[PDB]
């Protein structure tokens, strides 16, 4: 049985490992299929327990990963691709 | 620099901790506001790398969390709510 303060703390806006499809990070590369099709990135998630407050990053950094670029029925090559990651998060008023 | 096999293994359909809004797990309780408004649950996620294949659970358990049920402008109480969790996942045709 998870105690209130545990859930509360563990659930509040922070960077959490998040599985993100590569195509949505790189919309312009539809001639390709990627393996993997998604990557594990640290991204702001959780609740602000508040409302039109939103859980946004205030500190970012890049990370470079080895992804298979595949041209379907023609070939495949493992290249380096770069992705955004979230270092700090914070609940901020919206627009 | 994250190596190919690291990424592939770590991205493929498993249970991962996932922040889920309570309202969506209990859409009938609109009178209430919850604190926290979301919970950390093990849920299937990631890529099947394949296509109309789909990352679904094949094994579940319930977990019970202490959550604050708030009746706006009237009162607040900590009660217990149960949430579905995901122990194993698999890539299945849709």
């Amino acid at each position, epitope marked *: 049985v998870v105690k209130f303060m545990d859930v509360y703390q563990r659930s509040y806006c922070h960077p959490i490992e998040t599985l993100v499809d590569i195509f949505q990070e790189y919309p312009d590369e539809i001639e390709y299929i990627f*393996k993997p099709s998604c990557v594990p990135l640290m991204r702001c998630g959780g609740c602000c327990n508040d409302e039109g407050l939103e859980c946004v990053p205030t500190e970012e950094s890049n990370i470079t990963m080895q992804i*298979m670029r595949i041209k379907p*029925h023609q070939g495949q090559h493992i290249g380096e691709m770069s992705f955004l990651q979230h270092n700090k998060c914070e609940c901020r008023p919206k627009k | 620099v994250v190596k190919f*096999m690291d990424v592939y*293994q770590r991205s*493929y*359909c498993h249970p991962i901790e996932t922040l889920v809004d309570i309202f969506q797990e209990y859409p009938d309780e609109i009178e209430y506001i919850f604190k926290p408004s979301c919970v950390p649950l093990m849920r299937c996620g990631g890529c099947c790398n*394949d296509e109309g*294949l789909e990352c679904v659970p094949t094994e579940e358990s319930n977990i019970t969390m202490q959550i604050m049920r708030i009746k706006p402008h009237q009162g607040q109480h900590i009660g217990e709510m149960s949430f579905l969790q995901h122990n194993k996942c698999e*890539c299945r045709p849709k």
Partner: antibody
Amino acid sequence: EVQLVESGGGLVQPGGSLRLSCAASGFTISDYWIHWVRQAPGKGLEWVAGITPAGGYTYYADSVKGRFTISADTSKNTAYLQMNSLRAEDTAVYYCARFVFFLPYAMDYWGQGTLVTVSS
Amino acid sequence: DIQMTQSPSSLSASVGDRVTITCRASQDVSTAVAWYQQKPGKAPKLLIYSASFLYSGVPSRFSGSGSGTDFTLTISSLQPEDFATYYCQQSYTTPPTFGQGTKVEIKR
């Protein structure tokens, strides 16, 4: 010309070990996964070992788990199948083969086979 | 734990005959199937990948079709050189397996 050149089979004692080489030329092996398929005398193709696409984990046939281990030296552009404590029923022609994504889930180049015969 | 059952186990067909080998996976596997021809003692050769696609180099009289559990190698017009053992293989859900094979001889 792309091809896969195996070697290193032949005659072994029961309980002995062997390691097969699968040397790639005309392409770079780190961009692929090399699977191993074998075939006993007058029997069908049995899949042996290889990194599988569901989970990316090296997987081994039940009949072989814990004795066979694939490795790879990408500076030699070669892959290996280390075979340990060989049982008589390992006697087969072993093929290595190029597992591919771009021709989905297919094996497009194969080595010529090496006879591995297990007998005292 | 998945299986692949080819039909028939073996057949004789005259030069010119339409030949159909079927292949029935006990579980669903999309179009993630290939067919390989293997001439006696020699390394298997890729005929068909992703269920219906013809590997480049292979003669047009080979075709593949199907998804789910039921799959079909067709040879529209059998040549004398086509005698071999034909295999289906699945490599998409673990474990990867082959069918038992279908030995084709030429009837004359």
